[PDB]
């Protein structure tokens, strides 16, 4: 189902127009709240004292109707950045008047145009209005993919249209929006109404708008093609754009008059609904992760904290992750015990961080599948999960499993392990301190013992996402550093963002660690070629792990384990957005730091410009040992 609105600049009489618009199938209506031609004077007499009502009454609709069906529109004669001072003054006052009437009505959204380069005074008046009282309604900036000057007909004989490619110039409307929102200081109430044109620009021009807060897409009727039966349709290129806007779940707006007058006007809407039901149906990942798009969460710390019951339940809903673990244990058992020794050799498996037992069960299933004999220790320091484990052991597992309520770094094992199995990995691999945990459990692993996983590697990638930067920003808390929210990572299902370069490996660990001197501190320098103009807001983090040999798990996009949804990516933000131009290299530097009580990350951008070093000494974020 598609959420759709009708844009009109002519409403003789609201009740009739709203009814016809509702019949056609539209969910809301963009309309003027003052008559678009009703230019008003505020300074000079006698036009300043024009009598009569300035617009029509709020009583014509119910509060609920104003609140949910009407999107306001700034009058087209209001030009706050005019060169004529008298037009500037009048436009400032009229803009405030129309915006205040919108707030008076409780409108959910208000459309304002970005139709030229210089909108500084427009930005200041809007910002002054946003900071007048506390309101939550949205301001949709109407900005086209292609500027009006750049798509006009080549019909002026002494002013021919440019036929020479201007890579940056064809991106000019993104700069209009970027400058405008920067003046307004990334106000959460200001979003983009992207106006689509008859001719789409090159892919890089569209691609600027990736990660931008697009709330609406405006489709003029003049961009629709005309099929065999005369129904309005779209080009192959426009369909690709609609599909990829449908993933952001924007609202679609139909503007312009009917140009398929043989057909009914609703048909424009009907084609959008047609396209929306023929997109690829939700995969398993999308079905489960619904609602989590760009939702920020603090990373779980299963070592420092005792996880709740429903957190383990979420861990357990992923059959792919544990069958992979089963397959890894299965292959190791066959490698370790030969066919001839299968009844005499009992392998000692220890699950280090057993949780509620999913790894224990997968180890039992792998033993039967390999038809080999295993002895199990289930080590778990969370005494609440040990309740689950000991009820399992008594009722079902029996004496084959020995539940151990201890920290794996302190437990004095009665014997050594053939295999240690663990799921101590976070979204950024080592960010739950899996290296420190397995390092301390290493002594009771046999000299030829196997650790599952045997290895894991984190990956970073620079991302652009004004939306995500705006949500970190909103995480400022009382009674702490006012910029601390930028100096900590978040577990988040990255959705509305642009990846600026391919993920590159960051930190890697292997187990067991045969090195005589073990140091889990790390320092890594990454250079990301960026072949686009953009704005850097942070770094997406992923990981890959080798459970055993060729059995792997990955959330790295280009090697993502198909169907597994256990881990969302992690996001490392930066305090200040950084402009990056095409051909420039982003250089980021990450440190893994530690003392005897805490582990943390520090990071800094060093090219094309330097950022501040983030989280020095773990002042804003640490991971408890």
């Amino acid at each position: 189902r598609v959420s759709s609105g009708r844009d009109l600049n002519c409403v003789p009489e609201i009740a009739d127009t709203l009814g016809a618009v509702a019949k056609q199938g539209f969910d809301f209506l963009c309309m003027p709240v003052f008559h678009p031609r009703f230019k008003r004077e505020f300074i000079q007499e006698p036009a300043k004292n024009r009598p009569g009502p300035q617009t029509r009454s709020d009583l014509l609709l119910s509060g609920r109707d104003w609140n949910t069906l009407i999107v306001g529109k700034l009058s087209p004669w209001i030009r706050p950045d005019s060169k004529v001072e008298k037009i500037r003054r009048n436009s400032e006052a009229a803009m405030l008047q129309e915006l205040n009437f919108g707030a008076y009505l409780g409108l959910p959204a208000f459309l304002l145009p970005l139709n030229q380069e210089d909108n500084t005074n427009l930005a200041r008046v809007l910002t002054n209005h946003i900071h007048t009282g506390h309101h939550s309604s949205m301001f949709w900036m109407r900005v086209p993919l292609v500027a009006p000057e750049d798509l006009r007909d080549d019909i002026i004989e002494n002013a021919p249209t440019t036929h020479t490619e201007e890579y940056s110039g064809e991106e000019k409307t993104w700069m209009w929006w970027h400058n405008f929102r920067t003046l307004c200081d990334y106000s959460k109430r200001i979003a983009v109404a992207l106006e689509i044109g008859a001719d789409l620009p090159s892919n890089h021009v569209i691609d600027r708008w990736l990660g931008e807060p697009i709330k609406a897409a405006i489709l003029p009727t003049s961009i629709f093609l005309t099929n065999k039966k005369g129904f309005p349709v779209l080009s192959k290129m426009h369909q690709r754009l609609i599909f990829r806007l449908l993933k952001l779940e924007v609202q679609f707006i139909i503007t312009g008059t009917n140009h398929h007058s043989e057909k009914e006007f609703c048909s424009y809407l009907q084609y959008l609904e047609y396209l929306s039901q023929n997109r690829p149906p939700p995969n398993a990942y999308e079905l489960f992760a619904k609602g989590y798009e760009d939702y920020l969460q603090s990373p779980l710390q299963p070592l420092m904290d005792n996880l709740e019951s429903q957190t383990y339940e979420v861990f357990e809903k992923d059959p792919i992750k544990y069958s992979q673990y089963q397959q890894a244990i299965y292959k190791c058992l066959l490698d370790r015990v030969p066919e001839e020794e299968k009844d005499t050799n009992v392998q000692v498996l220890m699950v280090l961080g057993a949780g509620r037992g999913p790894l224990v069960n997968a180890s039992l299933r792998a033993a039967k599948q390999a038809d080999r004999r295993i002895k199990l220790y289930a080590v778990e320091k969370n005494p609440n999960a040990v309740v689950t484990l000991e009820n399992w052991q008594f009722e079902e597992w029996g004496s084959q499993v020995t539940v151990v309520s201890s920290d794996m770094r302190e437990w004095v094992a009665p014997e050594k392990a053939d295999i240690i199995v663990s799921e101590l990995l976070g979204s950024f691999a080592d960010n739950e301190l899996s290296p420190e945990c397995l390092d301390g459990a290493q002594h009771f692993l046999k000299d030829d013992g196997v650790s599952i996983p045997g290895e894991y590697t984190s990956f970073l990638a620079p991302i652009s996402s004004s939306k995500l930067y705006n949500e970190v920003r909103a995480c400022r808390e009382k009674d702490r550093d006012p910029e601390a929210q930028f100096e900590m990572p978040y577990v988040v299902r990255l959705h509305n963002f642009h990846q600026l370069s391919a993920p590159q490996p960051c930190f890697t660990f292997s187990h067991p660690n045969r090195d005589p001197m073990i140091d889990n501190n790390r320092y890594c320098t990454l250079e990301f070629p960026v072949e686009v103009n953009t704005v850097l807001h942070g770094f997406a983090g992923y990981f890959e792990t080798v459970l055993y040999q060729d059995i792997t798990l990955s959330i790295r996009p280009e090697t993502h384990s198909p169907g597994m949804f256990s881990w969302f990516p992690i996001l490392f933000p930066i305090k200040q957005p950084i402009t990056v131009r095409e051909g420039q290299t982003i250089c980021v530097r990450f440190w893994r730091c530690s003392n005897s009580k805490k582990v943390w990350y520090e990071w800094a951008v060093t090219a094309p410009v330097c950022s501040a070093i983030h989280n020095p000494t773990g002042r804003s974020y640490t991971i408890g040992l």
Binding site: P12, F34, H35, R37, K39, E41, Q44, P76, E157, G256
Partner: protein, 308 residues
């Protein structure tokens, strides 16, 4: 009168004298519950805008942004709805009947002008577009997107069927000639000035026209020339209308609520602050060439005696 609304809307938008002296009126309601328009005929101009004394009346679907006579019984209308409308007086000249209503513009139609061939007309709109109309077949023959902002004014050449002017908020004054493969030519001052808001061809000299800007300046331009201007108004110049004299005068009207009458050198001869709101149109009587009828948003129809 029958089929005529009891009261016309307050915001008077247009006033055009016919050859016989009857007054065409266009008006729109720009506030209140209903935003529509209406068209009126006043064979008695001194009775305007009183509805009871009108010769004919009809109300339109939306507001009237601009209109113009088509011959002597036709009325071409630029509508808020995005439509160009043609209305025709009946043989009785007591009704105003809809000939065609075509929704071809995607925004408000802001300006319309009948070409000298009498069978074609040009319209400009807030949708940046300009269209050439064939009034007979009721179709758009050409749709031009030369400008980069809303089109403020289009004005057909007096005697060249294929030539007309246009001016937009993109700061372009375009001279059009549909006989050319690229029909538009950007003319005017090479250096950018204030946005042009109104246009008027000189009635005698095929190469000469005047234009007003958003800053109150009125400028006399010879296209074949190789500029004369005067700061006439304190706000936007809304329109410019040449008198029907052999050596014509120039009526300029503005949002400063004043009317001015200029001679050939843009020197001022007359000035009227009779209106208490925006002055929207001005039309010279063909019967008495020193009468100038202005209308405005104050709902006034003022009959000026112009010292000629």
């Amino acid at each position: 009168p029958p089929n005529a609304p009891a009261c016309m809307e307050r915001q008077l938008e247009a006033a055009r004298y016919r050859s016989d002296g009857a007054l065409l009126l266009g008006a729109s309601s720009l506030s209140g519950r209903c935003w529509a328009g209406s068209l009126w005929l006043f064979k008695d101009p001194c009775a305007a805008p009183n509805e009871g004394f009108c010769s004919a009346g009809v109300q339109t679907e939306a507001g009237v942004a601009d209109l113009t006579w088509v011959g002597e019984r036709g009325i071409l209308v630029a509508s808020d709805s995005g439509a160009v409308e043609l209305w025709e007086l009946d043989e009785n000249e007591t009704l105003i009947v809809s000939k065609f209503c075509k929704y071809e513009h995607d925004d408000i139609v802001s300006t319309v002008s009948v070409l000298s061939s009498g069978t074609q007309a040009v319209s400009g709109s807030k949708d940046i577009c300009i269209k050439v109309w064939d009034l007979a077949q009721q179709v758009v023959l050409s749709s031009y997107r030369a400008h980069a902002a809303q089109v403020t004014c289009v004005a057909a050449s007096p005697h060249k069927d294929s030539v007309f002017l246009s001016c937009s908020e993109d700061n372009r004054i375009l001279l059009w000639d549909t006989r050319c493969p690229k029909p538009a030519s950007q003319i005017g001052c090479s250096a950018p000035g204030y946005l042009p808001t109104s246009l008027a061809w000189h009635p005698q000299q095929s190469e000469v026209f005047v234009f007003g800007d958003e800053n109150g300046t009125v400028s006399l331009v010879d296209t074949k020339s190789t500029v004369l201007s005067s700061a006439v108004h304190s706000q936007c110049v809304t329109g410019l209308v040449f008198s029907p004299h052999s050596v014509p005068f120039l009526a300029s009207l503005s949002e400063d609520c004043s009317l001015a009458v200029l001679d050939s050198s843009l020197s001022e001869l007359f000035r009227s602050q009779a209106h208490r709101d925006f002055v929207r149109d001005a039309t010279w009587s063909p019967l008495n060439h020193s009468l100038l009828t202005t209308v405005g948003w104050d709902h006034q129809v003022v009959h000026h005696v112009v010292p000629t």
